[PDB]
């Protein structure tokens, strides 16, 4: 169904003296979270959302919980290992993050594979596009590189990527495919705000849309105002949908010379709006 992705976001954060490291695995289908493991519980387990639960069965999630706890403890060792690599004191907090998964094309074939690591928020090591070689970011990661090169880690990942990862993704759709069902078109409107003197601000709002990708533009009699334009980062409404706005400062009395354009994949075609003053 066009290209699709299965991606896992992994976080391991040490907190010496204040407990065991906090470990999390978060799985996303097409940027939609569908499962989460969080080690910060008395008896922690995989928490698949309703669909993946019982459309997969209890045994399965049991086994993934056990695999999660296995990963958790392996990462515990890694945090200790990296202290050594970087000659860091044992008393500070550090983080390891991974993005791991695959993207398939509409033909079901693997388009892209992900296996990338960061330490304290900087790139550490990553599997290259060729799915055979590794890019180490620094001297510490060269130690991990040599070690994986020896054990053939890259080949271990290709098998997962082309086997398990890709197959999970093919399984999800058919069965469902719920990111077009989750498509929501923006509803737009322009607001009007006073500036000092003879300028006014026109603010074009896009609300209640999913997915997050969107474009807002202002045009003055054809020709995007490719500057002087203010906007905010797209932001979640908290109900699943997103918001954005773009504003321009225009002369008082000339508000009808400006048009806002809204481009979103949910729309039959770009929205075009102007400031509408009540009468």
């Amino acid at each position: 169904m066009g290209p699709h992705s299965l991606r896992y976001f992994v976080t391991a954060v040490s907190r010496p003296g204040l407990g065991e490291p906090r470990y999390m695995e978060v799985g996303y289908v097409d940027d939609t979270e569908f499962v989460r493991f969080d080690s910060d519980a008395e008896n922690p387990r995989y928490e698949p959302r309703a669909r993946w639960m019982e459309q997969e069965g209890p045994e399965y999630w049991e086994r993934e919980t056990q695999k999660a706890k296995g990963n958790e403890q392996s990462f515990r060792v890694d945090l200790r290992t990296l202290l050594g690599y970087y000659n860091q004191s044992k008393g500070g907090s550090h983080t390891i993050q991974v993005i791991s998964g695959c993207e398939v094309g509409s033909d079901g074939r693997l388009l892209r594979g992900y296996q990338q690591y960061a330490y304290d928020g900087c790139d550490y090591i990553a599997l290259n596009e060729d799915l055979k070689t590794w890019t180490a970011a620094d001297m510490a990661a060269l130690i991990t590189k040599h070690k994986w090169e020896q054990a053939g880690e890259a080949e271990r990942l290709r098998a997962y990527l082309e086997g398990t990862c890709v197959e999970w993704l093919r399984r999800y759709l058919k069965n469902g495919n719920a990111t077009l069902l989750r498509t929501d078109s923006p509803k737009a409107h322009v607001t009007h705000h006073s500036r000092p003197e003879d300028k006014v601000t026109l603010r074009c709002w896009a609300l209640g849309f999913y997915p997050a990708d969107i474009t807002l533009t202002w045009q003055l009699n054809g020709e995007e105002l490719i500057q002087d334009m203010e906007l905010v980062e797209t932001r979640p409404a908290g109900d699943g949908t997103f918001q954005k706005w773009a504003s321009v400062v225009v002369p008082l009395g000339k508000e009808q010379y400006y048009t806002c354009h809204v481009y979103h994949q949910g729309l039959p075609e770009p929205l075009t709006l102007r400031w509408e003053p009540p009468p």
């Binding site: 896992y8 992994v10 695995e25 799985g27 993934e64 695999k67 999660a68 296995g70 990963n71 392996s74 990462f75 060792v77 890694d78 290992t81 990296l82 390891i96 991974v98 791991s100 296996q115 690591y117 550490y124 090591i125 991990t144 070690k147 994986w148 054990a151 880690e153 271990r156 990942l157 997962y160 398990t164 990862c165 999970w168």
Partner: peptide, 8 residues
């Protein structure tokens, strides 16, 4: 389904 991770 996430992979099994290997030691750094």
């Amino acid at each position: 389904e996430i992979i099994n991770f290997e030691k750094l």
